[PDB]
Symmetry: D2
Subunit: 201 residues, 4 copies
């Protein structure tokens, strides 16, 4: 209804051998699709709650909305944050490259901090590079599940799915290798565009 | 310092009798100030980590940042969302008023849903009215603590602090009385401004 | 129905001036009573769900049960963990005293660790001294809200309510003073009995 | 070391075809071992803190302990709760069987409620059947991660790991098929033993 499932800007197997087509197909067709259906159903439920003036399940509906909508947002950004190797620059440049050096010291320091945040998660979660509109800087955050451990108003620039379904079929328990191979398919041109729009408040 | 304590646009007792000046002074001078110092320290510690190449406490630092920065963000909007009785419109009008009718059916439905979300929180949290950039709609979210149960990219329009320190000294355990009194001091002018700036007309 | 509200083993004002009778009366009559009613209602809801074979709200009911039942358990232990000054020994002795020296080094070290855990909570929570039946030792835990951040099978020995409603009317934002005064009314004889029953697996 | 990795009461492929031996080996040798090392380190760090009188990282250490110790506890029960098909009763009997009928109406109702709690988890977690010492009854709880959404004093009787690593390699995203297969390998003899020891006859 309100939300729709976006299609991939590339073929399921375009990111191989870094991320297999098997994961991509299940991740998109099964997982992401579930969040879209869940977010719409949450809205229908909230609408029905208003019509009958019965808000007894408000706590459930607010979590259903937050969980599924955050899942939809996180994955929509995730797909575009990636592109076949060689399709995008190896490292950030111009506006983004300068900003990263300012807030992290160097590209490698930002990479090290992002990596540490990605692998240290106790449970499901995400590693994220966001624009802080209040402090007007780029920070790294560690999301719990899809909707926890983040300030309101945070604009996602670059995100990495650290839920097990994103790497288990390929890397098993070795998260370190998954994050290692992911750096090869990061679409820095997409992050650059997000950084530009985020900068206008 | 990257973050600083904003000054109140009114005196501590300007919201009486709806909200005690005793609560306002402690809430701003003590509580809000703490989030600013915490958020600044979190960034300093992270800079320390990168310099030493030691990210052992990454999980702690990332939570310290999200919790404190979110507290800073939540209270900053909270102060401006309020104004003395009779100094602002008693009802949303124009663009904001039309949007609320479109996404909630009416102003009464919006209030009912917002109130239900406020009083039903199991633990500390917030009742929020945010702009959803993906679905291009206004939704109500129920924050847990300061940084939980919310999608990234959510832009706060109207917020209500449901932590016990925000009402205990005056209303005790009666959460219902607190929320009912709070509706009288809502500055709809500020909300309308945030609504327009959330998407630039 | 299943759960009932236990009465205080002393008068509301018996713990003064460390904890006022005003807090005790509201905490018991209003707060604890709410958890008992909530826990029973959660069971009725789960029973009704089984009768009609409709488990659509299972996520809500499981959290309602866990939140309210944990609240009931935590406060039931909290009341007995306290007694008027002079009614119980100032420090633990015999079995308990020996165990504390073994797992913490000294009584003061356990006090310091417990205090640090109590005051550092980011949001609502509890500081707790529990018996770990797997490791067969006494550990300190920091509960989030009432039902988070604890292993299953943990047996509560000594607990301190760190929710704002437990100290705000008296100590305001100064948590440090609340914890400081609480040590004066700890009923070590009650903790000793809990330690004995916990030890038998 | 305070904690140690328990050995499996059967071979890795003993539960096939219901649960793959590939999953069993990684789950025990890699995953469970990690919680043991983490729990031990958490205690060593806490001892370090007391010695230095520096509890600055108390919030991190307390979460590290709860998360890892809970993982250790949850998996220890999980292994024993299972046995090869045909090596244990296919249905609860005697004392345990009568108790389930008393608290759930029937075995089918218990299974339905347990299944609903298992498949509906939003994120990582567990479906648990515990003994409630306060209410003197058997309840179903839905754990988040390893250490969330549960009352203190809860004694685990039967547990099901709903984290993605527990079923992804064999069942993919179909959680329903995993839970349906798992019922075939439940060792009701072990559950009955834990039920009796939870309250000593
Ligand atoms: Fe994912
Ligand atoms: Fe506040
Ligand atoms: Fe309390
Ligand atoms: Fe597991």
């Amino acid at each position: 209804a309100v939300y729709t499932l976006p299609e991939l800007p590339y073929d399921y197997s375009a990111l191989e051998p870094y991320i297999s087509g098997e994961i991509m197909e299940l991740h998109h067709d099964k997982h992401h699709k579930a969040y879209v259906d869940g977010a719409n159903t949450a809205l229908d439920k909230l609408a029905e709650a208003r019509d009958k003036a019965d808000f007894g399940a408000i706590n459930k509906l607010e979590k259903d909305l937050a969980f599924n909508l955050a899942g939809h947002v996180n994955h929509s950004v995730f797909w575009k944050n990636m592109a076949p190797k060689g399709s995008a620059p190896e490292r950030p440049t111009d506006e983004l490259g300068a900003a990263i050096d300012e807030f992290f010291g160097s590209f490698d320091n930002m990479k090290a901090q992002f990596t540490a945040a990605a692998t240290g998660i106790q449970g499901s979660g995400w590693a994220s590079l966001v624009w802080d509109p209040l402090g007007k800087r780029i920070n790294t955050l560690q999301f719990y599940d899809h909707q926890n451990n983040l300030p309101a108003g945070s604009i996602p620039l670059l995100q990495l799915d650290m839920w097990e379904h994103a790497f288990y079929l390929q890397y098993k328990n070795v998260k370190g290798d998954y994050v290692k191979s992911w750096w090869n398919v990061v679409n820095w041109d997409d992050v650059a565009l997000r950084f530009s729009e985020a900068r206008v408040a």
